[PDB]
Amino acid sequence: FPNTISIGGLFMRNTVQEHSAFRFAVQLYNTNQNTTEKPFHLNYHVDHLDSSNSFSVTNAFCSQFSRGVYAIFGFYDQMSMNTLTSFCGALHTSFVTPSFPTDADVQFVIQMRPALKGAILSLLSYYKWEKFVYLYDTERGFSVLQAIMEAAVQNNWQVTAISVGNIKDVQEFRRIIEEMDRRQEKRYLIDCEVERINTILEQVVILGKHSRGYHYMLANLGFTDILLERVMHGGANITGFQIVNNENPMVQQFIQRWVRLDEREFPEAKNAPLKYTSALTHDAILVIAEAFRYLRRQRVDVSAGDCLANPAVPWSQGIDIERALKMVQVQGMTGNIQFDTYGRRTNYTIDVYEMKVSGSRKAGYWNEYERFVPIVVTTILESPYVMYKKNHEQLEGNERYEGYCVDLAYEIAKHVGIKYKLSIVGDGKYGARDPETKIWNGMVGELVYGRADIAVAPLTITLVREEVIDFSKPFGVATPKGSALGTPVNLAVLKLSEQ
Amino acid sequence: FPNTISIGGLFMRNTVQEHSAFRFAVQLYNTNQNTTEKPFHLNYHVDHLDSSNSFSVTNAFCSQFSRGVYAIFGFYDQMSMNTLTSFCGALHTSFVTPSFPTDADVQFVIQMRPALKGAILSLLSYYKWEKFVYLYDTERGFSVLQAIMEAAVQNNWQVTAISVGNIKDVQEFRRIIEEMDRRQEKRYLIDCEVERINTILEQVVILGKHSRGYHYMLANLGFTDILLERVMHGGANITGFQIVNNENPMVQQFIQRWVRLDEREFPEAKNAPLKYTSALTHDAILVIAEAFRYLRRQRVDVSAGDCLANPAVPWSQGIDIERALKMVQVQGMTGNIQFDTYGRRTNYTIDVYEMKVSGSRKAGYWNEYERFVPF
């Protein structure tokens, strides 16, 4: 058994802190005094990628492989995911990565980041969400998207998915929020990188739509690194996830010894919050060190060329190494550590945080077995149907309207048992179709496109409209297609007529 | 100047007609009699690859480079364009391909597929489209998606973009069509591969949404391969684009000699319609041959190392090779062939077809300077 173990390192851009944790964690292992806990020295070879062109990524990997390493620890993103994953599998070299888990199962890579699809789905059922907006990108895989859309069919939800992956101008973000606001959408499910989430919820506050009613779910680990001071002032609910618990004694010891380090040797150490990826980076050394300690106990023999060789014959000890790495069980900084056959984390735990005006609070945990143990009415102005009261300037609310229709709306609401907020269509027309643009206008246009629920007004009944919206019997009021207020209002007017 | 010129091939799966067309075009050039038009012999080292991996793709490319080639002609999909494009640009080896044009500006890549951004935008403004449903997938870059979104903000459109690139169960397609119809959406703009377009148009006819009133604009240069006979009879409106014109004397001559070929040595000949990608493959051999003849006439020095080397030393003469290939002006099947500084074609002649009950009808043509001119 070699007296020293060499492992590779591949760090992409904007990962300076993770580099410090990688260096710090290795130092802690080396400085240990007990012979049993430190049976061999540990070395490492760092390298920086570009993640833009596969020539740089391929060259960097071959430099590491040719030099001679046992395992490789590094990050990858969408562009360079395929190059590193494919090379590692063919050459029989493990790859301990804290990056997002791969969508398709693959061998010889162990991804130590818990998935969220299970946690998200349970919370959606817990809050009983039926319709909402879903903003997403493709910087972390399609796994979450393919589960939300698949679950919508089985539960008959009304998800409205939007892809904001390629948006580069804040105008698109503003229009998306405004357009979905017109449809009375109060629930959003933001699943994007940290930078995008900051931009998205910076637009909501400028638009001033962080009031009491709206609820936001931030499906992204790293709930600490999201600016939330401004949004929470309005009172809008917010929900996030975390895996690093500050009350665990292990994190407290690491954090206590992590802030006293010299700045020059370990940049961005003391005056910066600790990203969860730093916690995963520290854990990786525990997993790799533990795996090699086991390999030493069993007296398993272990001991390079160039990547592109025909035929590509891999060194036979690779299978043993990954088996050891996929069997360890260590109580790490992020909780229990256990890997299944394909290398994904299992028996993990996510802590959900429901943060309020006073501050963040822990609202429960999501174990893998115990899952999450804790009307606007449109109308047009036409006397005597709807008219302004004697003094509409002083009055506020729907108390400034007086006429025939407002009386009818009150009677219908009382029968059904709802609350109505009278609104005036700004177009000023009953409704018609433009022959060239095929765009409805007026009351029917608003009613069809989901901007209203019922429409009490002198809306003449005709064949053209009846094909688009469901009227009631003549008195007729209108409702969207498939709305649940169709039958109750139809009977309400019929019984009113009989009296 | 060498007595013979050797190039390479890189064909992925679902590519048989193009492979036979690539062989036929080379044979056509080699068998010519006029010594002025056939100064040098041409050869190829065709090789197949699997894009699903990135270890076999680079392994196949490095074998081509080590063998020694002057230019490489091959295809690439979304998940393997980075490896091919990046290696070529770093080792100074041109790459003539008929596949989809790249989103970014990259050198040492010559693309023979005309873009569709201009044609779609002009048609949308000509038909007064201000409320449509944009179904799309990302198998051919995001170039079209950005153009539509940027145009919508400027022109104040209302686009409901839905990504259908990751749908395997047809029930999802049914829900999308049913819901969008509930909002009174009559105009669609389907931008997907040929296989997916067939699936979508299959669900439309089953649902009975193919009657008069609905307008479908198939944004793909494959109008001669979409199975839409059923929708034709329904009465809906269909619009499509094409680049290959059957009245061109060159097209007619090639097809006359195309169907007479052997059915075993040249598979997919005399059996299936000539996919437009086969036309681009024939034009690629026109461009490669013409560019190298020009170099021989001008008395330029052209005349292999390891695939990967820490000192990246490119060819000294590879700038000349890819400079000549971008000056060509050779009339071919797809109209005028002429490249700009980035390897993207210029002076297109995109052709618009509108289909009626009688049959497909020439509705007009779109040009970069004259935009859309109907007749």
Author numbering:
A (entry chain C): 2 to 304, 309 to 379, 397 to 497, 737 to 760
B (entry chain B): 2 to 304, 309 to 380
Verbatim from the authors:
GluA3, a subtype strongly associated with disease, functions as both a fast-transmitting Ca2+-permeable AMPAR at sensory synapses, and as a Ca2+-impermeable receptor at cortical synapses. Here we present cryo-electron microscopy structures of the Ca2+-permeable GluA3 homomer, which substantially diverges from other AMPARs. The GluA3 extracellular domain tiers (N-terminal domain (NTD) and ligand-binding domain (LBD)) are closely coupled throughout gating states, creating interfaces that impact signalling and contain human disease-associated mutations. Central to this architecture is a stacking interaction between two arginine residues (Arg163) in the NTD dimer interface, trapping a unique NTD dimer conformation that enables close contacts with the LBD.
The GluA3(R163I) structure highlights the contribution of Arg163 to the GluA3 architecture. Rupture of the Arg163 stack not only alters the structure and dynamics of the GluA3 extracellular region, but also increases receptor trafficking and the expression of GluA3 heteromers at the synapse. As the NTD dimer interface orchestrates AMPAR biogenesis, a mutation here may alter assembly, explaining the synaptic phenotype of GluA3-R(R163I). Indeed, GluA3-G(R163I) did not increase EPSCs, probably due to its preferential assembly into GluA3 homomers.
